[PDB]
Amino acid sequence: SGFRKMAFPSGKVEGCMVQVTCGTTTLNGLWLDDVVYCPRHVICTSEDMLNPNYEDLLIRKSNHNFLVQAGNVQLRVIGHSMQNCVLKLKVDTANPKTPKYKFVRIQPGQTFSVLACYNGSPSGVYQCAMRPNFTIKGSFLNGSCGSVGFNIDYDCVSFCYMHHMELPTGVHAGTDLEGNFYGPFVDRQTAQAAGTDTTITVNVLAWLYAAVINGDRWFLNRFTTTLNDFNLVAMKYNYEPLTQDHVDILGPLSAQTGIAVLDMCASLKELLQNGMNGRTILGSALLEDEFTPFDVVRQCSGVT
Amino acid sequence: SGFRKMAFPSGKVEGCMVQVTCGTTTLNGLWLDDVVYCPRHVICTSEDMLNPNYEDLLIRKSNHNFLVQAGNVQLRVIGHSMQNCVLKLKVDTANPKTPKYKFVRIQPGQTFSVLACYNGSPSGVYQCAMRPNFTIKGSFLNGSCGSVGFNIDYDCVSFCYMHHMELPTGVHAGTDLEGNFYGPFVDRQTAQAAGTDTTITVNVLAWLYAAVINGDRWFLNRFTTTLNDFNLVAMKYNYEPLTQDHVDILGPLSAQTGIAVLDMCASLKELLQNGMNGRTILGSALLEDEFTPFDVVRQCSGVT
Ligand SMILES: COc1ccc(N(Cc2cccc(Cl)c2)C(=O)Cn2nnc3ccccc32)cc1
Numbered sequence: 001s002g003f004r005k006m007a008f009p010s011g012k013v014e015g016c017m018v019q020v021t022c023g024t025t026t027l028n029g030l031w032l033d034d035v036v037y038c039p040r041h042v043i044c045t046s047e048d049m050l051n052p053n054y055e056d057l058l059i060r061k062s063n064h065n066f067l068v069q070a071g072n073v074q075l076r077v078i079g080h081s082m083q084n085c086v087l088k089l090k091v092d093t094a095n096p097k098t099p100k101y102k103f104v105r106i107q108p109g110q111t112f113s114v115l116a117c118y119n120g121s122p123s124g125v126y127q128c129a130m131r132p133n134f135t136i137k138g139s140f141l142n143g144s145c146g147s148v149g150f151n152i153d154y155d156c157v158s159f160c161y162m163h164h165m166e167l168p169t170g171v172h173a174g175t176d177l178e179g180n181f182y183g184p185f186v187d188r189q190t191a192q193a194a195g196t197d198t199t200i201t202v203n204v205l206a207w208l209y210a211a212v213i214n215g216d217r218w219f220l221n222r223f224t225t226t227l228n229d230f231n232l233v234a235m236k237y238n239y240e241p242l243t244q245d246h247v248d249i250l251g252p253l254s255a256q257t258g259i260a261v262l263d264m265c266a267s268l269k270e271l272l273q274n275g276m277n278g279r280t281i282l283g284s285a286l287l288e289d290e291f292t293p294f295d296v297v298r299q300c301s302g303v304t
Numbered sequence: 305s306g307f308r309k310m311a312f313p314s315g316k317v318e319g320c321m322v323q324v325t326c327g328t329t330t331l332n333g334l335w336l337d338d339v340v341y342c343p344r345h346v347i348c349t350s351e352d353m354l355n356p357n358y359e360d361l362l363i364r365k366s367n368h369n370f371l372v373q374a375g376n377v378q379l380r381v382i383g384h385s386m387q388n389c390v391l392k393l394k395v396d397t398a399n400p401k402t403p404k405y406k407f408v409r410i411q412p413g414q415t416f417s418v419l420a421c422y423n424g425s426p427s428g429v430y431q432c433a434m435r436p437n438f439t440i441k442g443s444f445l446n447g448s449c450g451s452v453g454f455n456i457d458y459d460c461v462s463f464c465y466m467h468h469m470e471l472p473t474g475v476h477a478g479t480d481l482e483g484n485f486y487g488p489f490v491d492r493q494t495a496q497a498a499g500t501d502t503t504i505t506v507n508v509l510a511w512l513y514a515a516v517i518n519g520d521r522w523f524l525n526r527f528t529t530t531l532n533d534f535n536l537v538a539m540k541y542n543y544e545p546l547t548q549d550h551v552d553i554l555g556p557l558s559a560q561t562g563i564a565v566l567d568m569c570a571s572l573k574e575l576l577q578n579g580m581n582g583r584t585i586l587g588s589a590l591l592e593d594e595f596t597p598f599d600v601v602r603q604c605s606g607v608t
């Protein structure tokens with residue numbers, strides 16, 4: 001028993017982190033096979049970030065200008081290309097520690113682990129979610145760019161995120177491993193405001209199911225609701241609308257606990273309207289939305 | 305910016321996890337050099353746990369009864385010994401992935417990362433604290449025993465915890481790597497109740513300093529207090545007494561922010577007395593105590 005904000009074991013990704021330096025800018029790169037992926041803003045100075053012309057800046061760079069260091073050994077760059085907002089640096093040596101991997105573009109509400117890195121060296125690992133406004137609430141300092149987000153399915157790492165920037169509001173933005181930003185963000189230091197950070201309803205419900213499984217049941221009530229009635233309350237509280245797809249996804253947790261999805265919705269509706277009254281659920285005084293229904297089943301079943 | 309409950313990168317510890325089976329009991333072991341460390345209750349059945357005589361149960365076991373599997377390859381056991389509540393299984397092969405390591409016995413209030421494992425395979429990593437009542441609030445299912453807690457200082461892993469059991473109350477108990485339990489717990493399925501789970505005051509103050517560094521400053525007030533006055537409030541709220549040693553430990557955070565330790569204590573005193581009023585600090589609606597002052601400096605400085 002017990003329910004924690006758990007990250008995936010990071011070893012497979014640690015074996016892929018490298019340092020990439022271009023001129024006076026140093027950030028992290030991801031070395032998979034004979035390619036090193038990193039943010040294209042490695043070619044920029046802090047001044048260039050105000051209005052960068054990446055194509056023009058990149059013309060002035062040659063393979064020997066991209067310094068890639070894996071541990072304490074230098075990798076030889078034999079090609080470079082820009083794909084969307086990432087650079088792919090072809091090196092002459094395949095990473096011997098390349099795990100089985102996929103590049104996946106995640107949907108908002110999905111969770112992943114981030115291995116925060118500086119100078120190609122891992123500092124820590126934490127679990128987070130892609131917000132509905134396409135930002136992430138991470139922990140990134142200057143130099144963390146190129147740190148990646150991933151999920152693991154047994155021995156296959158699905159990379160979903162590469163860190164690019166911090167918005168003036170303190171939230172984070174980045175790309176998938178094809179270099180396409182999540183949401184409307186651009187790699188330019190300009191006025192970019194995030195939209196409404198709504199709560200991921202299906203995740204809150206999954207976490208309420210984890211609470212029941214792990215003993216916290218005080219919030220269960222004698223009520224039920226409908227999807228339309230629940231959604232009227234969800235709209236009022238800036239919660240994402242719950243769909244029949246979400247209800248279906250919560251089926252296995254509903255079956256395990258014997259609590260119908262709409263009954264759990266009615267419990268959530270009362271928590272929104274009445275608050276917690278100074279009580280906690282799974283050690284939290286707010287409704288947690290960074291656990292997907294798949295995370296709840298995975299953690300509650302012990303998938304390795 | 306941003307502040308997350310970050311765990312240490314787990315790769316160095318992943319390279320040490322093995323499966324240990326004795327009879328019909330399977331749990332995890334830690335393979336360092338030519339020794340595999342695991343809970344001595346690997347020799348027990350569920351029935352034996354009610355009243356085990358470990359010395360007598362161990363007499364009936366020989367080296368060939370301890371099956372140790374590292375990945376998909378079997379390790380040869382050439383010796384076994386019981387040290388306190390752990391078994392040390394000497395194997396004929398040194399772990400080639402043995403990191404630089406130390407065994408450390410931590411004090412209550414100190415934090416560490418846990419690599420939850422099942423069948424010698426890592427499932428996840430999370431950060432937690434040794435509670436003042438010597439329990440941990442982890443996420444452990446049956447089969448997780450022998451999963452370890454650790455801290456990393458650059459390339460040296462300091463192992464501090466090995467998981468042994470779940471108390472009837474849902475909290476966790478275990479030993480250091482010398483096999484001595486933290487607190488008064490014993491490896492017997494009996495009435496063992498945890499004492500008061502007080503809040504780690506020095507950690508809450510460190511986390512308030514992290515909040516100021518990372519932008520959340522609403523809770524800062526125009527007051528100050530003394531250690532004795534603060535402690536009268538801390539006692540009332542089941543917070544650990546703050547000592548001059550704690551004030552000294554918070555010195556660097558006080559210097560960085562320009563907020564005197566006793567002024568931050570007065571802010572904490574008002575938060576205890578008035579509550580949060582529906583507001584949050586670093587995304588939390590309660591005062592977080594699982595970050596030490598060293599964790600705050602480490603995360604806010606980007607130590608790798
Ligand atoms: C090459 O020199 C720089 C210099 C600065 C950046 N910027 C600014 C920027 C850049 C494009 C967009 C926005 Cl909204 C903002 C970053 O956000 C990079 N970054 N990422 N996580 C951080 C955490 C703390 C501080 C800086 C952090 C990027 C490149």
Ligand SMILES: COc1ccc(N(Cc2cccc(Cl)c2)C(=O)Cn2nnc3ccccc32)cc1
Binds near residue numbers: 447
């Ligand atoms: C060899 O067979 C068993 C069988 C059971 C246990 N017990 C019971 C016990 C044992 C000594 C003390 C207490 Cl208070 C309680 C455990 O607590 C082991 N364990 N650890 N984390 C768990 C999470 C969920 C379920 C079980 C979990 C140990 C050995």
